[PDB]
């Protein structure tokens, strides 16, 4: 797990999420997709305690898909983010809390605006222009503070993200094996194959 980022630009939200899965002194996998599509215009990335991460992501995914079928309608990113937060807020006072941090990137079709929500395992929600979980933010937040502009294009966003990954690859102690990058916009969710 470890590295998950998100940038919201003019017309899309971009999530970048590390590919490594490490247990002990071994990188077991270098092509891991730390993300689940919750609905056609909503994507959630995640990081945290082994097992908990996927179990939580898939549980939320199942719940949103159920909602979609029942209402023949797609929940807004705000609605999904609030559902997710509440689920985590319950979890934190459970016998065994989900130790999962998430970013939710969605395109709200009613408002034609992209939206990025950062939520930690305590159920602490914030909407942001750019976000990160874990040690990632200690490098990227300062860098995005500098280079980010609100009216950027998807392509400007990707270059801004390439800067972030470059910095992390220079200064982070661990080899996170690059990132899978995904774009969420008015046409849904697609994956950038070369990064």
């Amino acid at each position: 797990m470890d590295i998950i980022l998100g940038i919201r630009v003019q017309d899309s939200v971009i999530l970048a999420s590390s590919k490594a899965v490490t247990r002990g002194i071994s990188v077991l996998k270098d092509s891991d997709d730390k993300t689940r599509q919750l609905s056609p215009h909503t994507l959630m990335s995640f990081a945290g305690e082994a097992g908990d991460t996927v179990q939580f992501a898939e549980y939320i995914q199942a719940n949103i898909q159920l909602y979609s079928i029942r209402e023949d309608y797609e929940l807004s990113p705000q609605a999904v983010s609030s559902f997710v937060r509440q689920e985590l807020a319950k979890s934190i006072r459970s016998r065994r809390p989900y130790q999962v941090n998430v970013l939710i990137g969605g395109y709200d079709k009613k408002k034609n605006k992209p939206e990025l929500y950062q939520i930690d395992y305590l159920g602490t929600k914030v909407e942001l222009p750019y976000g990160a979980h874990g040690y990632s933010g200690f490098y990227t937040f300062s860098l995005l503070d500098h280079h980010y502009r609100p009216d950027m294009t998807t392509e400007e966003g990707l270059d801004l993200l390439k800067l972030c990954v470059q910095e992390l690859e220079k200064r982070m102690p661990m080899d996170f094996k690059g990132v899978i990058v995904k774009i969420v916009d008015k046409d849904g969710i697609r994956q950038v194959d070369d990064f």
Partner: protein, 204 residues
């Protein structure tokens, strides 16, 4: 691992002549890392204002909870909740979680719609009511707010003066706390107009 000082933030409230003020900073961090500069800690249900400092997930949860309870109150009572009454509901609700509490420092401010009296109150995490004529403080810079208020404050300030006083109490308390700051909001509240002002402050 002290939940009340992970996210950081502050709230202060004051009475004046036929008015009240309630202010908060805008910071939300994860210990040393500042994360959001837009995290407001003051909410309102009708004309009753509630500020909440502490663990941010509980701040959000309690807002959502008191919105829930005040909406039902209004539907059944056919009137908006008053601050004296809301203060009691806050106390009930926190003490209900006596041995697994929400990690918060709520503050209530408002003007009773029948009597016209200004009203403020503060709470510990477990529901104890601290009522006060003058001011209430809360958050990670509460020591600092106490020191500012206790010297700066005087009774019966007019809304435009109270604004300056509360803003200066907040700002200078915030600048001596690493976990408070990053913006500020002040609410000036009179019988039937409420003015919200964002303050310019240092962003470190």
């Amino acid at each position: 691992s002290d939940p009340s000082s992970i996210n950081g933030g502050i709230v202060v409230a004051m009475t004046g002549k036929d008015c009240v003020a309630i202010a908060c900073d805008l910071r939300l961090g994860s210990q040393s890392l500042g994360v959001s500069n837009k995290f407001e800690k003051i909410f309102h249900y009708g004309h009753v204002f509630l500020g909440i400092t502490g663990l941010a997930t509980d701040v959000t949860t309690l807002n959502e909870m008191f919105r829930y309870k005040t909406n039902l109150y209004k539907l059944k009572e056919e009137r908006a909740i008053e601050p004296e009454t809301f203060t009691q509901l806050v106390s009930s609700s926190l003490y209900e979680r006596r041995f697994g509490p929400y990690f918060v420092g709520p503050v209530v401010a408002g003007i009773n719609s029948k009597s016209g009296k200004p009203f403020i109150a503060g709470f510990d995490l477990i529901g104890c009511i601290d009522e006060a004529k003058d001011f209430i403080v809360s958050g990670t810079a509460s020591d600092q707010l106490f020191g500012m208020c206790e010297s700066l404050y005087e009774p019966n300030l007019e809304p435009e003066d109270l604004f300056e006083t509360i803003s200066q109490a907040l700002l200078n308390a915030a600048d001596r706390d690493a976990l408070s700051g990053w913006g500020a909001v002040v609410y000036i509240i009179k019988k039937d107009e409420v003015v919200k002002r964002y303050l310019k402050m240092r962003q470190d």
